[PDB]
Amino acid sequence: NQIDLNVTCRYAGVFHVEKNGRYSISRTEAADLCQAFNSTLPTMDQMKLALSKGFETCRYGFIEGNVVIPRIHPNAICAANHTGVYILVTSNTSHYDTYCFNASAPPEEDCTSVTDLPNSFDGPVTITIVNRDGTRYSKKGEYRTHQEDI
Numbered sequence: 685n686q687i688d689l690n691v692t693c694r695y696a697g698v699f700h701v702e703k704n705g706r707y708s709i710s711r712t713e714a715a716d717l718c719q720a721f722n723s724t725l726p727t728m729d730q731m732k733l734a735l736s737k738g739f740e741t742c743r744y745g746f747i748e749g750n751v752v753i754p755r756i757h758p759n760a761i762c763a764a765n766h767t768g769v770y771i772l773v774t775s776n777t778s779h780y781d782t783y784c785f786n787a788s789a790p791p792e793e794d795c796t797s798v799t800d801l802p803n804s805f806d807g808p809v810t811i812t813i814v815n816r817d818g819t820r821y822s823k824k825g826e827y828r829t830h831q832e833d834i
């Protein structure tokens with residue numbers, strides 16, 4: 685009973701989280717996930733600022749209202765070579781990664797590791813934060829509040 689959460693650098697408080705390195709988070713689970721990080725789903729304005737500071741990924745994730753990929757550099761296999769905050773328009777499916785926003789984070793690029801999940805609640809799951817440099821932090825707990833997400 686284990687979940688890996690792959691997390692990125694923060695840019696103006698905004699970061700990306702993948703569950704088990706595969707698209708697998710529902711919109712309701714994304715909100716609970718960010719809450720476990722004492723974070724919220726970013727607004728488009730927050731995300732655009734993060735992008736201006738250096739934030740980009742090659743993965744779809746939720747923000748408040750939309751599913752997006754922030755892109756700085758054109759890449760043919762990432763958001764169809766677009767730049768800016770690319771908005772997913774047409775999809776059959778409901779499960780993606782998530783973006784999260786922590787207001788307490790540094791204002792620009794913070795590429796330090798994440799070493800806590802400060803607002804997870806009591807639970808039976810071994811939750812492991814996995815940073816891009818491989819550093820890991822684990823704790824027993826839960827963050828999902830909706831039964832349909834478990």
Ligand SMILES: Nc1cccc2c1CCN(CCCOC1CCOCC1)C2
Nearest residue numbers: 690691692702705706742743814815816
């Ligand atoms: N931040 C982080 C920490 C630990 C592992 C990882 C990441 C981000 C990328 N992520 C990629 C996982 C799957 O690669 C995707 C497949 C879909 O297209 C973009 C790359 C791995």
